[PDB]
């Protein structure tokens, strides 16, 4: 009895870590903003942080206001804040600078400073009630989620081959168990109904399950819903519906949320807000088909 | 010299390193596969390698054959080979010749094993004539390309080690040589793509990476279409930004690619799409090809 929406998640009062991910270009940033907006509107008494773990940030471009290492409120909302981690500035901040910049260019520093962001938030609880992650594409996001488990094993052996580390050692374990708690942490997969997206999404979900990451929600984005004389739209819709049936069959225990390809561009608090409502209440192509042209330009 | 095609690059005989990158979902893999095919077809006398530096590989999905850490020829081609580096398998291999799984799960390892592939490839030349890189999305490709500059600075201050330091400098000078290395940006004519592509090209130039080719992918060309409320609306949006791209990048090769009605997968359909990287796509003439997949 898994409704085709994220209503249970949007109105969830237990989730503390919500990951939004998937193949590149499927709509991770657009979806993670929509989820963040919906939770913020649905639960006005709780504070929400939307962090981008993708090095090439798109949160600022999406809302139209500049974000940085320090969490700032989203203009027009009272309980949603964004954060785009800057490897360069952040390292300059901790040092206080050429060599600092040099360490800042090393691969992995992005996931490390992100984990460090998570880690300092847990210390805060022991701020924001829930944290949504606009993750990088599949490949590097997995390594990030492996970071708790990787640090835990690495840490004890570190101790040996070598007090402050022991406190650190407890915190990593705390993160490790919360990411494996279905009530606390979940991963929302975004995808499009295309051939190359199917196999990577499946491949992503399986690997996430092997990490004990809870995943029960799939957003199928950029759907045409064409069904009346356009050759390309009908051809591509014919393609989309076929794979859409295959997804519904494989993921019958999942929340499979279907989102339309809008005629306008989803930008600003308003259009994101106007789009996100279809993550809460399912999109009806016959009824709500007008909303795809009502986007402000 | 600014022709809206990659004919000059496909028939290039000096380039040894070709990077294909850009924002996610714009079509890096499809384009990097298409470029590799065109070069292979244009230069029968040369062997070409197509490496994927993206951890979530799509070369196998795109061609329909399993590739791995060991380079394999593409079925149906005599001079084109792909390689999908697998971090877990590679590290166990290094251990069995001379902790490995853990280091294989550490963030950045993918960029490290990619550079090692490049680094050991250079050692071989001192083999494939040209190597095409299907890079990861904008954020992490930058980390990878900074690695030569990064390793040099880290390595020199730290102090066979000299031979390694010599190899890094060799890569560093070759990646900054416009005749040897270039970066091809792929993008779509959409707002969020406009600012990330620009941001990426500017950062690449600061690394002394040559970039003079931009692929604008998934264009509708609706006015040229058979003849729709949404398509004309989205093309109207695409054409607006497309004019802006033409204006800003007048020094670049701006190659425009149509949104096909079929799916570009397998050697045949990839080839048929790749031809539009050599001779520009004419919506009035070549409009039938988008349904022949």
């Amino acid at each position, epitope marked *: 009895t898994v409704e085709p929406n994220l209503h249970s998640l949007i109105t969830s009062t237990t989730h503390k870590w919500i990951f939004v991910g998937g193949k590149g270009g499927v709509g991770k940033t657009t979806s993670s903003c929509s989820i963040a907006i919906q939770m913020a509107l649905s639960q006005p008494n709780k504070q929400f942080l939307l962090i981008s773990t993708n090095p090439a940030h798109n949160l*600022s471009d999406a809302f139209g206001e500049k974000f940085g290492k320090d969490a700032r409120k989203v203009t027009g909302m009272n309980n949603l804040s964004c954060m785009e981690i800057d490897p360069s500035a952040a390292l300059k901040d901790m040092n206080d600078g050429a060599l600092a910049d040099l360490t800042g260019s090393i691969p992995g520093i992005d996931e490390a400073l992100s984990f460090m962001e998570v880690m300092k938030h847990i210390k805060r609880q022991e701020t924001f009630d829930t944290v949504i992650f606009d993750t990088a594409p599949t490949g590097h996001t997995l390594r990030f989620l492996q970071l708790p488990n990787t640090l835990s094993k690495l840490l004890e052996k570190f101790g040996e081959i070598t007090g402050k580390l022991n406190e650190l050692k407890a915190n990593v374990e705390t993160i490790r168990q919360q990411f494996t708690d279905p009530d606390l942490t979940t991963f929302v997969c975004v995808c499009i109904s295309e051939f190359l997206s199917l196999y990577e999404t499946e491949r992503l979900i399986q690997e996430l399950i092997s990490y004990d990451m809870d995943v029960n929600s799939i957003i199928v984005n950029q759907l045409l819903f064409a069904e009346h004389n356009c050759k390309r739209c009908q051809a591509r819709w014919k393609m989309q519906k076929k794979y859409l049936d295959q997804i519904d069959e494989l993921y019958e225990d999942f929340h499979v949320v279907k989102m339309p390809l809008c005629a306008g561009e989803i930008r600003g608090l308003n259009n994101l807000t106007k789009f996100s409502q279809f993550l809460n209440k399912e999109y009806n192509p016959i009824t709500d088909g007008k909303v795809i042209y009502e986007l402000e330009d | 010299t600014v022709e809206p095609n990659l004919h000059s690059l496909i028939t290039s005989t000096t380039h040894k390193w070709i990077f294909v990158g850009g924002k996610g979902g714009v079509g890096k893999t499809t384009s990097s596969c298409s470029i590799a095919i065109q070069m292979a077809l244009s230069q029968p006398n040369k062997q070409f390698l197509l490496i994927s530096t993206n951890p979530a590989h799509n070369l196998s999905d795109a061609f329909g054959e399993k590739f791995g850490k060991d380079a394999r020829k593409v079925t149906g081609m005599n001079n084109l080979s792909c390689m999908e580096i697998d971090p877990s398998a590679a590290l166990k291999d290094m251990n069995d010749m001379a902790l490995a799984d853990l280091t294989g799960s550490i963030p950045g390892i993918d960029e490290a094993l990619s550079f090692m592939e490049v680094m050991k490839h250079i050692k071989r030349q001192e083999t494939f004539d040209t190597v095409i890189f299907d890079t990861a999305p904008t954020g992490h490709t930058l980390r990878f390309l900074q690695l030569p500059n990064t390793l040099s600075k880290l390595l020199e201050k730290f102090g066979k080690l000299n031979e390694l330091k010599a190899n890094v400098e060799t890569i560093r000078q070759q990646f900054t040589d416009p005749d040897l290395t270039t970066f091809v940006c792929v993008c779509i004519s959409e707002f969020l793509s406009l600012y990330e592509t620009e941001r990426l090209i500017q950062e690449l130039i600061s690394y002394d990476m040559d970039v003079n080719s931009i692929i604008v992918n998934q264009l509708l060309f609706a006015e040229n279409d058979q003849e729709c409320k949404r398509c004309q609306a989205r093309w109207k949006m695409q054409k607006k930004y497309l004019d802006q791209i033409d204006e800003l990048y*007048e020094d670049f090769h701006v190659v425009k690619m149509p949104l096909c009605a079929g799916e570009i997968r397998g050697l045949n359909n990839l080839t048929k799409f790749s031809q539009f990287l050599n001779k520009e796509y004419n919506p009035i003439t070549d409009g039938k090809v988008i349904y022949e997949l």
Partner: antibody
Amino acid sequence: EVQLVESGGGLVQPGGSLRLSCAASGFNLYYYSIHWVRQAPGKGLEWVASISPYSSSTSYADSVKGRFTISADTSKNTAYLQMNSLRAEDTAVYYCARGRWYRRALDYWGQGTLVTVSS
Amino acid sequence: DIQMTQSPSSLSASVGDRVTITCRASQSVSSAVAWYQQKPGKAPKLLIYSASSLYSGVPSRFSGSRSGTDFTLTISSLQPEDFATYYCQQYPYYSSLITFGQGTKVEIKR
């Protein structure tokens, strides 16, 4: 309708500091670039600084480099020019202008604000 | 170091005359050049961008052209409201810098 309004101009002594504001309306300052251009009495136009919020980038003429600092506040849709160590040579009418990502031509200008540096 | 050499610093013309103002770039800047009109005490107005593209609302008597590093502003038939000072401007891709010409004052011939 797009318009820019400069403010903050006045009299300060050589070596002193002064902060200019350029308040924008009719467009979102984030997706554009804003530029300060000054004009000394009887002389031509001299670009001094630029800021692009969308690419976190800023740029300065060497004539003011290290003395001036340009910034933007997207929440209030306003740009600023922080001028320190001012000299008589910095005396001029200061304009702010926009500013496109695909076109570094200046299409909208403010009315200008007078900055006088003298003891 | 990059320079835009504008010429002449001043030129005299009468109503109905065809006026030509030139600006030479020290390096190649491609077509990244704009032209402005400024009347005394007032802010400059954009006339042309990309060397030869007429900005919105600017009279068609205004025209731009390029030949290498040489850029030309043309007024087909000078009108009384056209008497003022004009500035060439480059914004080449490779550079973050904006550099202006010395200006050209268009006066009334007598």
